[PDB]
Amino acid sequence: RRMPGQCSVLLFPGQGSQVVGMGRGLLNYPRVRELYAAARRVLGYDLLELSLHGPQETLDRTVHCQPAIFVASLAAVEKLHHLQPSVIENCVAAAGFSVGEFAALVFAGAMEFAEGLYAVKIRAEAMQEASEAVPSGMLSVLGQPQSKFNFACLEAREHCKSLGIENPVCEVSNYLFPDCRVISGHQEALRFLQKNSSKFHFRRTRMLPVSGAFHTRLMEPAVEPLTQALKAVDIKKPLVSVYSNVHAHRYRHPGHIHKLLAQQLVSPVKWEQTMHAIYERKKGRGFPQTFEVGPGRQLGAILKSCNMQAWKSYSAVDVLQTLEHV
RNA sequence: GGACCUGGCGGUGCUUCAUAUCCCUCUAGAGGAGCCUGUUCUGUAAUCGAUAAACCCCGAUCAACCUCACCACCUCUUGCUCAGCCU
Ligand SMILES: [Mg+2]
Ligand SMILES: [Mg+2]
């Protein structure tokens, strides 16, 4: 039973980490060019060019960002394996945020690159369709000890009930760290929350630049397409402990990933609970190494907020440049 | 009829101070978030109940298709060992 400090935990990012220049610093590393070639073969366009140099507005579109993040995450895993083989050898857990979950399974030997990427493509397209279906959006909110989230959601619904719309949606969509949440639903609700922050005791409020209300019932139309896409795919037993976003626990048997991966589409993301499940321990016990295989450093900040002692042994795989030309 | 005595109130309050423990003041930290437990109401035919008996092979852990426990149907019979149960 290895001492905590030798083992490693891989964290895969999700929506919102896209950035122009993604992939440079990973191409010359082994087996990455072939991965982008397979991405071309499956998608139908050149992901490599878009990630390397793109207008950032095409890259911000839902149909493109998710496959880009998936491919970049797996390329970063390849680079980390090249630099530090022991880190990949001694892996105890894996977790992804929204679409990075699909990456984690592929890293865990539960899926393959082609099938996983096809699933991600169908997911992104279906979500975009549902986003045009009804106007919707996402809002990140940081609260105080006096802040009531469900309560604020209730009046956020009361306003647009007074306006008049069918079963208005405004619910907490992402649990990411203490007192910081992301609420999802109609624009008028989130607009109401912005201007009643002071009443609702919100320190900060920031609209997420996303197309629609992810992880809510508004994305119900996108469940059935993705559902079909996962039937042909044969998921195996994950080799490492992969943690889910619906209920924030390990995937225990392969016969339930099929339905959890579709329930995630319309269920809040339990990221705080996943961090607690992976890192919570008695004071004085050591923590594992943590590697954010993928673009950005957001999960690093979220881990810093969630658990400082775990964050002390955190590092990120850089996907925008490389120190040595391999 | 006269004189005297004991008393008893398991009694009643107040006064002053010793009045330390206990106070009161005074000093220094302990509410939000996520999980797990206690109680209540509601609900089920039924137990969101337990692992000298699973899983895991960082810590812990939830339900695990482990297994025991509960509910609804059945089967076995002199059987394991003049058996068997932690009742
Ligand atoms: Mg039970
Ligand atoms: Mg028994």
mmCIF file with all atom_site columns, N, CA, C and O in Angstrom, chain A residues 62-63 66 121-137 166 169 185-187 210-226 265-266:
data_model
loop_
_atom_site.group_PDB
_atom_site.id
_atom_site.type_symbol
_atom_site.label_atom_id
_atom_site.label_alt_id
_atom_site.label_comp_id
_atom_site.label_asym_id
_atom_site.label_entity_id
_atom_site.label_seq_id
_atom_site.pdbx_PDB_ins_code
_atom_site.Cartn_x
_atom_site.Cartn_y
_atom_site.Cartn_z
_atom_site.occupancy
_atom_site.B_iso_or_equiv
_atom_site.pdbx_formal_charge
_atom_site.auth_seq_id
_atom_site.auth_comp_id
_atom_site.auth_asym_id
_atom_site.auth_atom_id
_atom_site.pdbx_PDB_model_num
ATOM 1   N N  . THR A 1 62  ? -19.595 25.547 -29.477 1.00 0.00 ? 62  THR A N  1
ATOM 2   C CA . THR A 1 62  ? -19.719 24.303 -28.721 1.00 0.00 ? 62  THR A CA 1
ATOM 3   C C  . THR A 1 62  ? -19.306 23.091 -29.545 1.00 0.00 ? 62  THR A C  1
ATOM 4   O O  . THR A 1 62  ? -18.689 22.156 -29.023 1.00 0.00 ? 62  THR A O  1
ATOM 5   N N  . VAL A 1 63  ? -19.646 23.081 -30.836 1.00 0.00 ? 63  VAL A N  1
ATOM 6   C CA . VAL A 1 63  ? -19.376 21.908 -31.658 1.00 0.00 ? 63  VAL A CA 1
ATOM 7   C C  . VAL A 1 63  ? -17.885 21.655 -31.821 1.00 0.00 ? 63  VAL A C  1
ATOM 8   O O  . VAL A 1 63  ? -17.488 20.535 -32.167 1.00 0.00 ? 63  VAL A O  1
ATOM 9   N N  . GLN A 1 66  ? -15.317 21.116 -27.484 1.00 0.00 ? 66  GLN A N  1
ATOM 10  C CA . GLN A 1 66  ? -15.282 19.854 -26.747 1.00 0.00 ? 66  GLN A CA 1
ATOM 11  C C  . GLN A 1 66  ? -14.371 18.818 -27.391 1.00 0.00 ? 66  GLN A C  1
ATOM 12  O O  . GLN A 1 66  ? -13.534 18.235 -26.678 1.00 0.00 ? 66  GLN A O  1
ATOM 13  N N  . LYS A 1 121 ? -18.421 14.128 -30.202 1.00 0.00 ? 121 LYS A N  1
ATOM 14  C CA . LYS A 1 121 ? -18.958 14.910 -31.313 1.00 0.00 ? 121 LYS A CA 1
ATOM 15  C C  . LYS A 1 121 ? -20.479 14.949 -31.264 1.00 0.00 ? 121 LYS A C  1
ATOM 16  O O  . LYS A 1 121 ? -21.092 16.018 -31.390 1.00 0.00 ? 121 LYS A O  1
ATOM 17  N N  . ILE A 1 122 ? -21.104 13.782 -31.096 1.00 0.00 ? 122 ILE A N  1
ATOM 18  C CA . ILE A 1 122 ? -22.563 13.727 -31.045 1.00 0.00 ? 122 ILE A CA 1
ATOM 19  C C  . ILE A 1 122 ? -23.076 14.534 -29.860 1.00 0.00 ? 122 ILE A C  1
ATOM 20  O O  . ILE A 1 122 ? -24.069 15.264 -29.967 1.00 0.00 ? 122 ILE A O  1
ATOM 21  N N  . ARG A 1 123 ? -22.408 14.408 -28.712 1.00 0.00 ? 123 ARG A N  1
ATOM 22  C CA . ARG A 1 123 ? -22.797 15.168 -27.531 1.00 0.00 ? 123 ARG A CA 1
ATOM 23  C C  . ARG A 1 123 ? -22.755 16.663 -27.800 1.00 0.00 ? 123 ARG A C  1
ATOM 24  O O  . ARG A 1 123 ? -23.705 17.389 -27.486 1.00 0.00 ? 123 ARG A O  1
ATOM 25  N N  . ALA A 1 124 ? -21.657 17.144 -28.387 1.00 0.00 ? 124 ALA A N  1
ATOM 26  C CA . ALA A 1 124 ? -21.514 18.575 -28.627 1.00 0.00 ? 124 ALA A CA 1
ATOM 27  C C  . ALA A 1 124 ? -22.575 19.075 -29.598 1.00 0.00 ? 124 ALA A C  1
ATOM 28  O O  . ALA A 1 124 ? -23.201 20.117 -29.371 1.00 0.00 ? 124 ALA A O  1
ATOM 29  N N  . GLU A 1 125 ? -22.797 18.337 -30.689 1.00 0.00 ? 125 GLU A N  1
ATOM 30  C CA . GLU A 1 125 ? -23.795 18.770 -31.662 1.00 0.00 ? 125 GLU A CA 1
ATOM 31  C C  . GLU A 1 125 ? -25.189 18.793 -31.049 1.00 0.00 ? 125 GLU A C  1
ATOM 32  O O  . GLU A 1 125 ? -25.944 19.756 -31.239 1.00 0.00 ? 125 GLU A O  1
ATOM 33  N N  . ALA A 1 126 ? -25.549 17.744 -30.306 1.00 0.00 ? 126 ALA A N  1
ATOM 34  C CA . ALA A 1 126 ? -26.874 17.691 -29.703 1.00 0.00 ? 126 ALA A CA 1
ATOM 35  C C  . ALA A 1 126 ? -27.061 18.809 -28.686 1.00 0.00 ? 126 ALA A C  1
ATOM 36  O O  . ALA A 1 126 ? -28.131 19.427 -28.619 1.00 0.00 ? 126 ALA A O  1
ATOM 37  N N  . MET A 1 127 ? -26.031 19.084 -27.884 1.00 0.00 ? 127 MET A N  1
ATOM 38  C CA . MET A 1 127 ? -26.128 20.176 -26.926 1.00 0.00 ? 127 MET A CA 1
ATOM 39  C C  . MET A 1 127 ? -26.299 21.509 -27.634 1.00 0.00 ? 127 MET A C  1
ATOM 40  O O  . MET A 1 127 ? -27.083 22.353 -27.193 1.00 0.00 ? 127 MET A O  1
ATOM 41  N N  . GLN A 1 128 ? -25.566 21.727 -28.728 1.00 0.00 ? 128 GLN A N  1
ATOM 42  C CA . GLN A 1 128 ? -25.725 22.976 -29.465 1.00 0.00 ? 128 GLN A CA 1
ATOM 43  C C  . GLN A 1 128 ? -27.148 23.112 -29.995 1.00 0.00 ? 128 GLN A C  1
ATOM 44  O O  . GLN A 1 128 ? -27.764 24.179 -29.869 1.00 0.00 ? 128 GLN A O  1
ATOM 45  N N  . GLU A 1 129 ? -27.687 22.034 -30.573 1.00 0.00 ? 129 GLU A N  1
ATOM 46  C CA . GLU A 1 129 ? -29.065 22.054 -31.053 1.00 0.00 ? 129 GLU A CA 1
ATOM 47  C C  . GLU A 1 129 ? -30.029 22.434 -29.937 1.00 0.00 ? 129 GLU A C  1
ATOM 48  O O  . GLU A 1 129 ? -30.869 23.327 -30.104 1.00 0.00 ? 129 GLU A O  1
ATOM 49  N N  . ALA A 1 130 ? -29.916 21.771 -28.785 1.00 0.00 ? 130 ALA A N  1
ATOM 50  C CA . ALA A 1 130 ? -30.794 22.100 -27.667 1.00 0.00 ? 130 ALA A CA 1
ATOM 51  C C  . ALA A 1 130 ? -30.577 23.534 -27.201 1.00 0.00 ? 130 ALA A C  1
ATOM 52  O O  . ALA A 1 130 ? -31.494 24.164 -26.665 1.00 0.00 ? 130 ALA A O  1
ATOM 53  N N  . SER A 1 131 ? -29.368 24.063 -27.385 1.00 0.00 ? 131 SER A N  1
ATOM 54  C CA . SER A 1 131 ? -29.107 25.442 -26.993 1.00 0.00 ? 131 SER A CA 1
ATOM 55  C C  . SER A 1 131 ? -29.853 26.416 -27.894 1.00 0.00 ? 131 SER A C  1
ATOM 56  O O  . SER A 1 131 ? -30.402 27.415 -27.414 1.00 0.00 ? 131 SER A O  1
ATOM 57  N N  . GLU A 1 132 ? -29.883 26.154 -29.206 1.00 0.00 ? 132 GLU A N  1
ATOM 58  C CA . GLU A 1 132 ? -30.707 27.010 -30.061 1.00 0.00 ? 132 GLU A CA 1
ATOM 59  C C  . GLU A 1 132 ? -32.191 26.779 -29.799 1.00 0.00 ? 132 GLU A C  1
ATOM 60  O O  . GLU A 1 132 ? -33.013 27.662 -30.067 1.00 0.00 ? 132 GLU A O  1
ATOM 61  N N  . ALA A 1 133 ? -32.554 25.596 -29.296 1.00 0.00 ? 133 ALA A N  1
ATOM 62  C CA . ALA A 1 133 ? -33.967 25.268 -29.113 1.00 0.00 ? 133 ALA A CA 1
ATOM 63  C C  . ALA A 1 133 ? -34.674 26.315 -28.259 1.00 0.00 ? 133 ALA A C  1
ATOM 64  O O  . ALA A 1 133 ? -35.740 26.819 -28.633 1.00 0.00 ? 133 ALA A O  1
ATOM 65  N N  . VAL A 1 134 ? -34.097 26.655 -27.111 1.00 0.00 ? 134 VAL A N  1
ATOM 66  C CA . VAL A 1 134 ? -34.624 27.716 -26.255 1.00 0.00 ? 134 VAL A CA 1
ATOM 67  C C  . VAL A 1 134 ? -33.451 28.560 -25.771 1.00 0.00 ? 134 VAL A C  1
ATOM 68  O O  . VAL A 1 134 ? -32.419 28.001 -25.373 1.00 0.00 ? 134 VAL A O  1
ATOM 69  N N  . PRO A 1 135 ? -33.547 29.888 -25.778 1.00 0.00 ? 135 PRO A N  1
ATOM 70  C CA . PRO A 1 135 ? -32.462 30.698 -25.217 1.00 0.00 ? 135 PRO A CA 1
ATOM 71  C C  . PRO A 1 135 ? -32.189 30.336 -23.762 1.00 0.00 ? 135 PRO A C  1
ATOM 72  O O  . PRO A 1 135 ? -33.110 30.162 -22.963 1.00 0.00 ? 135 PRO A O  1
ATOM 73  N N  . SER A 1 136 ? -30.908 30.207 -23.422 1.00 0.00 ? 136 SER A N  1
ATOM 74  C CA . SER A 1 136 ? -30.492 29.778 -22.090 1.00 0.00 ? 136 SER A CA 1
ATOM 75  C C  . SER A 1 136 ? -29.025 30.148 -21.904 1.00 0.00 ? 136 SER A C  1
ATOM 76  O O  . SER A 1 136 ? -28.335 30.522 -22.854 1.00 0.00 ? 136 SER A O  1
ATOM 77  N N  . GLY A 1 137 ? -28.557 30.056 -20.663 1.00 0.00 ? 137 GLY A N  1
ATOM 78  C CA . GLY A 1 137 ? -27.215 30.509 -20.349 1.00 0.00 ? 137 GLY A CA 1
ATOM 79  C C  . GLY A 1 137 ? -26.786 30.056 -18.971 1.00 0.00 ? 137 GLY A C  1
ATOM 80  O O  . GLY A 1 137 ? -27.517 29.361 -18.258 1.00 0.00 ? 137 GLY A O  1
ATOM 81  N N  . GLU A 1 166 ? -43.303 28.842 -19.920 1.00 0.00 ? 166 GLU A N  1
ATOM 82  C CA . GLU A 1 166 ? -43.593 27.474 -19.506 1.00 0.00 ? 166 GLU A CA 1
ATOM 83  C C  . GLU A 1 166 ? -42.465 26.936 -18.630 1.00 0.00 ? 166 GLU A C  1
ATOM 84  O O  . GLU A 1 166 ? -41.291 27.010 -19.006 1.00 0.00 ? 166 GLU A O  1
ATOM 85  N N  . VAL A 1 169 ? -36.808 27.617 -15.900 1.00 0.00 ? 169 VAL A N  1
ATOM 86  C CA . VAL A 1 169 ? -35.671 26.876 -15.370 1.00 0.00 ? 169 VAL A CA 1
ATOM 87  C C  . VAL A 1 169 ? -34.655 27.858 -14.807 1.00 0.00 ? 169 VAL A C  1
ATOM 88  O O  . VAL A 1 169 ? -34.197 28.763 -15.512 1.00 0.00 ? 169 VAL A O  1
ATOM 89  N N  . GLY A 1 185 ? -29.876 28.507 -16.706 1.00 0.00 ? 185 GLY A N  1
ATOM 90  C CA . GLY A 1 185 ? -31.265 28.651 -17.104 1.00 0.00 ? 185 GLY A CA 1
ATOM 91  C C  . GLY A 1 185 ? -31.461 29.886 -17.968 1.00 0.00 ? 185 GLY A C  1
ATOM 92  O O  . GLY A 1 185 ? -30.521 30.379 -18.586 1.00 0.00 ? 185 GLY A O  1
ATOM 93  N N  . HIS A 1 186 ? -32.698 30.375 -17.975 1.00 0.00 ? 186 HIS A N  1
ATOM 94  C CA . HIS A 1 186 ? -33.082 31.456 -18.873 1.00 0.00 ? 186 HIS A CA 1
ATOM 95  C C  . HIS A 1 186 ? -32.322 32.737 -18.550 1.00 0.00 ? 186 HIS A C  1
ATOM 96  O O  . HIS A 1 186 ? -31.921 32.969 -17.406 1.00 0.00 ? 186 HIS A O  1
ATOM 97  N N  . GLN A 1 187 ? -32.126 33.577 -19.573 1.00 0.00 ? 187 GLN A N  1
ATOM 98  C CA . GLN A 1 187 ? -31.380 34.817 -19.373 1.00 0.00 ? 187 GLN A CA 1
ATOM 99  C C  . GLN A 1 187 ? -32.049 35.716 -18.349 1.00 0.00 ? 187 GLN A C  1
ATOM 100 O O  . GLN A 1 187 ? -31.366 36.373 -17.565 1.00 0.00 ? 187 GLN A O  1
ATOM 101 N N  . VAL A 1 210 ? -20.797 30.758 -22.569 1.00 0.00 ? 210 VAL A N  1
ATOM 102 C CA . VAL A 1 210 ? -21.240 29.488 -23.126 1.00 0.00 ? 210 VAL A CA 1
ATOM 103 C C  . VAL A 1 210 ? -22.525 29.725 -23.911 1.00 0.00 ? 210 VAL A C  1
ATOM 104 O O  . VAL A 1 210 ? -23.180 30.758 -23.782 1.00 0.00 ? 210 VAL A O  1
ATOM 105 N N  . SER A 1 211 ? -22.877 28.740 -24.738 1.00 0.00 ? 211 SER A N  1
ATOM 106 C CA . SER A 1 211 ? -24.044 28.883 -25.602 1.00 0.00 ? 211 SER A CA 1
ATOM 107 C C  . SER A 1 211 ? -25.341 28.796 -24.807 1.00 0.00 ? 211 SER A C  1
ATOM 108 O O  . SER A 1 211 ? -26.247 29.616 -24.993 1.00 0.00 ? 211 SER A O  1
ATOM 109 N N  . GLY A 1 212 ? -25.450 27.811 -23.916 1.00 0.00 ? 212 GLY A N  1
ATOM 110 C CA . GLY A 1 212 ? -26.712 27.545 -23.251 1.00 0.00 ? 212 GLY A CA 1
ATOM 111 C C  . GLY A 1 212 ? -26.590 27.017 -21.838 1.00 0.00 ? 212 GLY A C  1
ATOM 112 O O  . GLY A 1 212 ? -25.503 27.007 -21.255 1.00 0.00 ? 212 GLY A O  1
ATOM 113 N N  . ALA A 1 213 ? -27.715 26.580 -21.275 1.00 0.00 ? 213 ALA A N  1
ATOM 114 C CA . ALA A 1 213 ? -27.770 26.075 -19.905 1.00 0.00 ? 213 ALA A CA 1
ATOM 115 C C  . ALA A 1 213 ? -27.391 24.602 -19.904 1.00 0.00 ? 213 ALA A C  1
ATOM 116 O O  . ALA A 1 213 ? -28.234 23.718 -20.051 1.00 0.00 ? 213 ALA A O  1
ATOM 117 N N  . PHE A 1 214 ? -26.101 24.332 -19.729 1.00 0.00 ? 214 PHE A N  1
ATOM 118 C CA . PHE A 1 214 ? -25.631 22.963 -19.623 1.00 0.00 ? 214 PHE A CA 1
ATOM 119 C C  . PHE A 1 214 ? -25.993 22.378 -18.263 1.00 0.00 ? 214 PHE A C  1
ATOM 120 O O  . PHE A 1 214 ? -26.182 23.093 -17.277 1.00 0.00 ? 214 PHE A O  1
ATOM 121 N N  . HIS A 1 215 ? -26.089 21.050 -18.223 1.00 0.00 ? 215 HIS A N  1
ATOM 122 C CA . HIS A 1 215 ? -26.332 20.310 -16.990 1.00 0.00 ? 215 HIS A CA 1
ATOM 123 C C  . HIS A 1 215 ? -27.656 20.693 -16.338 1.00 0.00 ? 215 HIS A C  1
ATOM 124 O O  . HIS A 1 215 ? -27.759 20.739 -15.111 1.00 0.00 ? 215 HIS A O  1
ATOM 125 N N  . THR A 1 216 ? -28.670 20.983 -17.149 1.00 0.00 ? 216 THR A N  1
ATOM 126 C CA . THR A 1 216 ? -30.027 21.219 -16.680 1.00 0.00 ? 216 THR A CA 1
ATOM 127 C C  . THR A 1 216 ? -30.991 20.439 -17.559 1.00 0.00 ? 216 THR A C  1
ATOM 128 O O  . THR A 1 216 ? -30.597 19.807 -18.541 1.00 0.00 ? 216 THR A O  1
ATOM 129 N N  . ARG A 1 217 ? -32.273 20.481 -17.195 1.00 0.00 ? 217 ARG A N  1
ATOM 130 C CA . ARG A 1 217 ? -33.278 19.771 -17.976 1.00 0.00 ? 217 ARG A CA 1
ATOM 131 C C  . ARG A 1 217 ? -33.501 20.398 -19.343 1.00 0.00 ? 217 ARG A C  1
ATOM 132 O O  . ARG A 1 217 ? -34.090 19.747 -20.213 1.00 0.00 ? 217 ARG A O  1
ATOM 133 N N  . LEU A 1 218 ? -33.055 21.637 -19.556 1.00 0.00 ? 218 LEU A N  1
ATOM 134 C CA . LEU A 1 218 ? -33.174 22.251 -20.870 1.00 0.00 ? 218 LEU A CA 1
ATOM 135 C C  . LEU A 1 218 ? -32.425 21.467 -21.934 1.00 0.00 ? 218 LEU A C  1
ATOM 136 O O  . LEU A 1 218 ? -32.786 21.541 -23.113 1.00 0.00 ? 218 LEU A O  1
ATOM 137 N N  . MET A 1 219 ? -31.400 20.710 -21.546 1.00 0.00 ? 219 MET A N  1
ATOM 138 C CA . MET A 1 219 ? -30.651 19.870 -22.464 1.00 0.00 ? 219 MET A CA 1
ATOM 139 C C  . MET A 1 219 ? -31.256 18.478 -22.580 1.00 0.00 ? 219 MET A C  1
ATOM 140 O O  . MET A 1 219 ? -30.571 17.542 -23.003 1.00 0.00 ? 219 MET A O  1
ATOM 141 N N  . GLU A 1 220 ? -32.522 18.321 -22.198 1.00 0.00 ? 220 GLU A N  1
ATOM 142 C CA . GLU A 1 220 ? -33.197 17.041 -22.382 1.00 0.00 ? 220 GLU A CA 1
ATOM 143 C C  . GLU A 1 220 ? -33.216 16.583 -23.835 1.00 0.00 ? 220 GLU A C  1
ATOM 144 O O  . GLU A 1 220 ? -33.009 15.379 -24.072 1.00 0.00 ? 220 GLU A O  1
ATOM 145 N N  . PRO A 1 221 ? -33.461 17.441 -24.829 1.00 0.00 ? 221 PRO A N  1
ATOM 146 C CA . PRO A 1 221 ? -33.444 16.964 -26.221 1.00 0.00 ? 221 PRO A CA 1
ATOM 147 C C  . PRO A 1 221 ? -32.125 16.341 -26.631 1.00 0.00 ? 221 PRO A C  1
ATOM 148 O O  . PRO A 1 221 ? -32.112 15.479 -27.517 1.00 0.00 ? 221 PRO A O  1
ATOM 149 N N  . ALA A 1 222 ? -31.016 16.746 -26.019 1.00 0.00 ? 222 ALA A N  1
ATOM 150 C CA . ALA A 1 222 ? -29.709 16.217 -26.377 1.00 0.00 ? 222 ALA A CA 1
ATOM 151 C C  . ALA A 1 222 ? -29.407 14.872 -25.732 1.00 0.00 ? 222 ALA A C  1
ATOM 152 O O  . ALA A 1 222 ? -28.375 14.271 -26.048 1.00 0.00 ? 222 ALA A O  1
ATOM 153 N N  . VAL A 1 223 ? -30.267 14.389 -24.835 1.00 0.00 ? 223 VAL A N  1
ATOM 154 C CA . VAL A 1 223 ? -30.019 13.108 -24.183 1.00 0.00 ? 223 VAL A CA 1
ATOM 155 C C  . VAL A 1 223 ? -30.157 11.963 -25.180 1.00 0.00 ? 223 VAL A C  1
ATOM 156 O O  . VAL A 1 223 ? -29.303 11.071 -25.247 1.00 0.00 ? 223 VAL A O  1
ATOM 157 N N  . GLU A 1 224 ? -31.239 11.962 -25.959 1.00 0.00 ? 224 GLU A N  1
ATOM 158 C CA . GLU A 1 224 ? -31.515 10.817 -26.825 1.00 0.00 ? 224 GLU A CA 1
ATOM 159 C C  . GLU A 1 224 ? -30.459 10.615 -27.902 1.00 0.00 ? 224 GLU A C  1
ATOM 160 O O  . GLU A 1 224 ? -30.047 9.461  -28.115 1.00 0.00 ? 224 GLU A O  1
ATOM 161 N N  . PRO A 1 225 ? -29.999 11.643 -28.627 1.00 0.00 ? 225 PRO A N  1
ATOM 162 C CA . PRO A 1 225 ? -28.901 11.408 -29.582 1.00 0.00 ? 225 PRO A CA 1
ATOM 163 C C  . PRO A 1 225 ? -27.686 10.761 -28.941 1.00 0.00 ? 225 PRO A C  1
ATOM 164 O O  . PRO A 1 225 ? -27.296 9.651  -29.329 1.00 0.00 ? 225 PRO A O  1
ATOM 165 N N  . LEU A 1 226 ? -27.103 11.415 -27.930 1.00 0.00 ? 226 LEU A N  1
ATOM 166 C CA . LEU A 1 226 ? -25.956 10.843 -27.233 1.00 0.00 ? 226 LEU A CA 1
ATOM 167 C C  . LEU A 1 226 ? -26.263 9.442  -26.740 1.00 0.00 ? 226 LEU A C  1
ATOM 168 O O  . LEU A 1 226 ? -25.417 8.543  -26.828 1.00 0.00 ? 226 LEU A O  1
ATOM 169 N N  . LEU A 1 265 ? -25.635 14.667 -18.552 1.00 0.00 ? 265 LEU A N  1
ATOM 170 C CA . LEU A 1 265 ? -25.984 15.722 -19.490 1.00 0.00 ? 265 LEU A CA 1
ATOM 171 C C  . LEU A 1 265 ? -27.048 16.654 -18.924 1.00 0.00 ? 265 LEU A C  1
ATOM 172 O O  . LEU A 1 265 ? -27.097 17.832 -19.295 1.00 0.00 ? 265 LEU A O  1
ATOM 173 N N  . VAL A 1 266 ? -27.898 16.154 -18.025 1.00 0.00 ? 266 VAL A N  1
ATOM 174 C CA . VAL A 1 266 ? -29.000 16.936 -17.470 1.00 0.00 ? 266 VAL A CA 1
ATOM 175 C C  . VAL A 1 266 ? -28.972 16.902 -15.947 1.00 0.00 ? 266 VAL A C  1
ATOM 176 O O  . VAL A 1 266 ? -30.016 17.032 -15.299 1.00 0.00 ? 266 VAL A O  1
#
